[PDB]
Design a protein around this ligand. Structure first.
Ligand SMILES: Oc1c(Br)cc(-c2ccccc2)cc1Br
Ligand SMILES: Oc1c(Br)cc(-c2ccccc2)cc1Br
Lengths: 115, 115, 114, 114
């Protein structure tokens, strides 16, 4: 129920091998590690979680954009791109978090569907 | 080799039933109709053309955003969103033209792959 | 009542010396030249028109993105970026058309105020 | 040396009265409060800091997008929009952090000039 997709606006391509870390806000207001992975050759990261594990909560998806750009010889502006949202608070949903990256800019959107 | 994908930034959803018209610049510098269709329930429009038909040229993809918004009770800013590009000028490629729509804004990107 | 602003998402800067052409849709559906200029050091193009001249109608703002990227030695995707809209007298009076440019992408918005 | 600008992609307008908090990363990796304010009628927040105070380091700009949409009676996706970056003295001296807001999306860019 959670997929992350990352595109490169410079190359016109998927952003491949981008590290993504997901956190969930705990009862004591700290960000607890929830899941992590890397985008594939399609720019997509699947398999982060399961419908059982992905309970209601506040989640942070951190996309490690700086590491991505530095490898292309670009010293970029941002440290990362973070997307913070409440999930599943009206019951289970499927979420795609998409990010379109440039060295000094990004755009992010969510596509939320009800299975 | 040509796919168009349209997302709605207000609803967090695919933009469904969006009309798309594709034109190709003719030898006399006019825009000739090339293909057309509507996005599906996934926001995607497939099957516009074939690799044989999609020769080198300058193409315009016109996405009829105004008609889309007016149906949601939004009087939007733009008449349409147009994407104009040279295709296949170094040999055949596959193109995804993506657009993320808001009433007064859109973002568009291309993902170009070599089969 | 019309300003155009262009920004560069690769360099994090205004997009300077970008050609901008504005057209008005004529009664026969062709695009007639209306205004043009080049963005300034701030990425802005002011003074395109006046309140008297900028009557209701459909306008097109064409931004020459391809020449901008080529001058930087970067290969771009689009031929240009086009923004097509209706000017409406019942709305607010001042229009800013902004474009944020990347080689294979652009974002555009309108800021319409009184 | 730091300005924050926020725009509304639904209404085509500045995003007015949006709370903005700026933090500086401390030596122990926590975020210490640095500056805050509310965007003006132009969607801009000026006067957050001074050249003397704005030393090299990692900063976070947090924009309270959820309250903005809620005030408009619109249900949004994000809790807030965060922009995290390093201030660098070898670059140009003035930073504009801009955010273009929609209920389920935002675009952000940096314009860094001398
Ligand atoms: O499958 C997607 C694609 Br192709 C592009 C985008 C996109 C993200 C930001 C701006 C424009 C398009 C999003 C998704 Br989902
Ligand atoms: O002064 C502006 C800045 Br700085 C950024 C934008 C902007 C445009 C498109 C996407 C994100 C920000 C618009 C304006 Br007027």
């Amino acid at each position: 129920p959670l997929m992350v997709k990352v595109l490169d606006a410079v190359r016109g391509s998927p952003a491949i091998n981008v590290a993504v870390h997901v956190f969930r806000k705990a009862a004591d207001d700290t960000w607890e590690p929830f899941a992590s992975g890397k985008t594939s050759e399609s720019g997509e990261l699947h398999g982060l979680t399961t419908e059982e594990e992905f309970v209601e909560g506040i989640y942070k998806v951190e996309i490690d954009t700086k590491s991505y750009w530095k490898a292309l010889g670009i010293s970029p502006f941002h440290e990362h791109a973070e997307v913070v949202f409440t999930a599943n608070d009206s019951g289970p949903r499927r979420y795609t978090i998409a990010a379109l990256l440039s060295p000094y800019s990004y755009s992010t959107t969510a596509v939320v569907t009800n299975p």
